[PDB]
Structures are given as C-alpha cells and as structure tokens.
Amino acid sequence: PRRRVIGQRKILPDPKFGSELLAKFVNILMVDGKKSTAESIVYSALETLAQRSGKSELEAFEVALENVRPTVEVKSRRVGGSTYQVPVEVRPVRRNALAMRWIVEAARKRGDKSMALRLANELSDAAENKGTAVKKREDVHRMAEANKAFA
Amino acid sequence: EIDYKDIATLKNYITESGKIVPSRITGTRAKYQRQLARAIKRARYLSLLPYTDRH
Amino acid sequence: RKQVSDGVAHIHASFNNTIVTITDRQGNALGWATAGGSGFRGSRKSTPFAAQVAAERCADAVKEYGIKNLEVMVKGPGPGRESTIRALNAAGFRITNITDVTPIPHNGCRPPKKRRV
Amino acid sequence: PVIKVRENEPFDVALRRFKRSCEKAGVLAEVRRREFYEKPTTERKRAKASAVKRHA
RNA sequence: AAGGCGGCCCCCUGGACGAAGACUGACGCUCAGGUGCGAAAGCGUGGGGAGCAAACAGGAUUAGAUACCCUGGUAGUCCACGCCGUAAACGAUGUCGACUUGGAGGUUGUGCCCUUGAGGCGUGGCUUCCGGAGCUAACGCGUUAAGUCGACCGCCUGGGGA
Secondary structure (H helix, E strand, C coil): CCCCCCCCCCCCCCCCCCHHHHHHHHHHHHHCCCHHHHHHHHHHHHHHHHCCCCCCCCHHHHHHHHHCCEEEEEEEECCCCEEEEEEEEEEHHHHHHHHHHHHHHHHHHCCCCHHHHHHHHHHHHHHHHCCCHHHHHHHHHHHHCCCHHCC | CCCCHHHHHHHHHHHHCCCCCHHHCCCCCCHHHHHHHHHHHHHHCCCCCCCCCCC | CCCCEEEEEEEEEEECCEEEEECCCCCEEEEEEECCHHCCCCCCCCCCCHHHHHHHHHHHCCCCHCCCCCEEEECCCCCCCCCHHHHHHHCEEEEEEECCCCCCCCCCCCCCCCCCC | CCCCCCCCCCCHHHHHHHHHHHHHHCHHHHHHHHCCCCCHHHHHHHHHHHHHHCCC
C-alpha cells in the first residue's frame, strides 16, 4: 500500500464458542482452504486442553496466548549501510496474530501423533511458560533488548 | 568616546560567556563596533573583563 | 570509602564514545564508567542509550560514597550530552549545576585534514 | 553555558535551559567546525557562497 | 600596484580621502629594452620544532590498491639572511582621460536646518547586487562597461608536435 488505506474484512465468529480469536486461530491453522479439517483439530485440542487444567476452554487458550504474546519486536533497517534493528512496540492485533502463528508453527514442529495432540501439548506447554513458542517469544524479546539502543 | 575603563558600558556588548556580541545583534555602527572591540580586548588584557566564562 | 555528599559528574561526550567520571569537589576521581565498557562496541557505542547506561553504571560505582548533590560538567560534541544528565538525575541525584566545559582554542593548533570519504 | 539550577525548578526545565544556553552559545557548531582543517580558499569560498545565498 | 595583510601595546614608516584657501604653471599619459616587488612549493647556511603532514612503515578495503579510510611519522610548515621568479599570479577583463537613463545597499569624510530623535536634505572617495539604451555568437557586461571615443603598450593567426 503506497497510498492505500485499507479497512478490515468481516471474520465470522466461532460456531462452537463464538470467539473471533478462535476463528482467526482456525484460519491460521487452515491449509488448502480446509476449514472443516482445521476446526476439528482446534476443537479436539481445546477439549483435551480443558480437562487438564480446569478453566474451561477459551480461558485456557487465552492463558496459553498470554505467554506467547510478544510486547516488542525488531524491524530491519538499512540506513547506516548495515543491519539496523530498531525495536518497535507491537500492536495488540499483531500481538495476537504473532502469538497464534508461533503456536501453530511450534505445534507443527512436534513429534506427537496427530495435529490435535500436538496443539494440545503446545498450548499446555505455553500455559506452563515453556515450549518452542515461548522460546521464540523470548528470542524476540532478547533481540529487542540487545538493540534497545536503536529505539 | 568608548573607553576601555568603562566596564559598566562594555558589559552590555559582551555575552554571558565574555564573547563580543556581533554588530547585527546590537545594531551599532561599524566604526563604534570596531572601537568597542578594541576597548573590550584592552579591558580583557587589564583583567577588567574575563576572556571566557572559565577564566 | 568515606561520605562525600558533594561530587562532580565529568561527562566526556566524544563522537565515538562517552566517558562519565564522578569526582569530589577537588577533582579526585571516585568512580567511572564508559559506553564501550558497558557492553557496546562499534555502532552501538556512539549512541545516547549507551551513554545513558554508562551514566547508570557510573552512578552505581559511587553508591559506597553516599553522594546526594553533584555537579555536571559536560565536555564534547558527541551524543550522550543530555542523555547522561537524564540518567544521572533518574539515579536519585540532586543536579545542582550543569556546565559546558568543551575546550575551544582561540585559533591555536592546526586540526587534521578533511576526510575524503 | 553555566546553568545553576535555581530553587523551585524541576530538573527537566533546567536541562532544557542548559540546552538552550549551549545552543545560543554555539559551542557544538564551533567544535564541529574545528575538527578538520579548512583551507583559507575553502573558508573564503564558503563565506562568499553563504553571503550570496543570504539574498532572497 | 599586485602578491597579500586579522589578539593587544609601543617605536619607525608609506599611501588614500575630505573642507576651505594659497602656491607652481602643462611640469602630463603611455612605455620596447631596463629595474624593482612578486602566494605556495623548492634550495643554501644557522636555529627552532607543539600541532599538521609529502616521502615512509604498518592495519584495513579490493580481483589487485604503490590510493581514498585508520595508527604513527621525516622533510617541510616557524625564525634570520640569501636564492628561486613560478600559480586557475582571475575580474580568465592593460594603463590613463572624457561622455551616456536608474534602483537598493555597505563603508569613510564633510556641509545645512526649532539638529526633534539613532532625523531629513545636499556634496565627495572607495565598494556589493539588480537593471535601461547600447553592445555581444550567446552567456552576459551595463556610469566600477564587455556602451561611444582618444593615446600608448602587450598579445593572437587551425588542432596536435609544443
């Protein structure tokens, strides 16, 4: 968008819980336009990640997101002929997007049997402040603290 | 009639750090500005005026 | 390590680095910290953030002396001229005076030649 | 550019006053001017160009 | 006069300008050859040497880097006395004189007026920018002419070789 100011598309709420967060999570987990295949995975993972804790589902999902949500990230910049990394503050919508994308890529990089099990384990790890999604968030925060001088 | 001994008058044409103010700021004639510069330098020599704000 | 309560913060703000030295009223140094010695090399060293953290670490090198009121003498054109002053005020210090003591030659020695970069 | 922080003034206004005084004194411009040698022909040409562009 | 000349003080010293007069009475202008002055670099002798910095050394960059950049660094830069006599030594515009609409400034004298004022109005010297006629191939110059003339001098005759 050189000049384009752009609005926002209408995302439908989740059929089971009525959450836009879960709808976007299903959208991020979906491949090849297979929304019904992704919804079953997300629902099975949320169910399995419900009995473990005890705070229903949506609450457990938000607890897992709270540990993967990055507050500050670095933006590459080419000014002084070299790699400038200015730590910029992340917006809440981009915060949720990054958290969900990291959780999905971390669950797909697992050795469990089904994607539902991988998701359940990744979300349980995130709620316990461990895993590879929390690892990536700490990596990003580390890279931001290193370049804090370039704010 | 600018006298290097008239420190009360010379202090009006120097900044807080002791530097001479330009003639564009005070709007004084070029001739009397040259006389003022000479008088301020002489008064700096006689230690009646400071060279700088340090010493 | 006795109590002073009257210090001077000598800030040497060069283009490539920033050196903060806290001395007593007479001029005897009590502690010092630099931008290059605080974990910054190359491009990060000549930044106001490096000067700020250097002023933070230098204020910790004098906590055993119990300084309450200290002066600020800034010298140099480099960055960190005001960043170090802010980092010193934020460290629980009563800034009493701020003074610029950058050396100005009255047309004295000949400076180096221009860089044809 | 000596700044004495007078009573009943916060630190921030004293720092801004110090910056204003050091810029009105022109110490940074001078120390940036004196770091490299400028030939007499170069400074004369620069002064002439500045006096010419100060005509608008 | 040009090259140039920049803290302050003293000693010696040249030129320019202005006011009102007095004086000499063409004593003037230009000038081949001649003579003198002539930035910087350079040379000789004797000093001095902080900073800077040809050469030089090392570190980088690079395909190479005998360079730009970085760390040092000798001559030199400084002083006295001689030599050198060259520069884009330029206004790329020889000197002297006369005449030709203007505007805004700068700098330095001088005169007049309840001096109202740091005022206004005249009158000289030098100086910056714009611009009219005119001139120019054009750019532009334009009362400080590259306009209209006069005196004398220097110089040019296709590009290289040179």
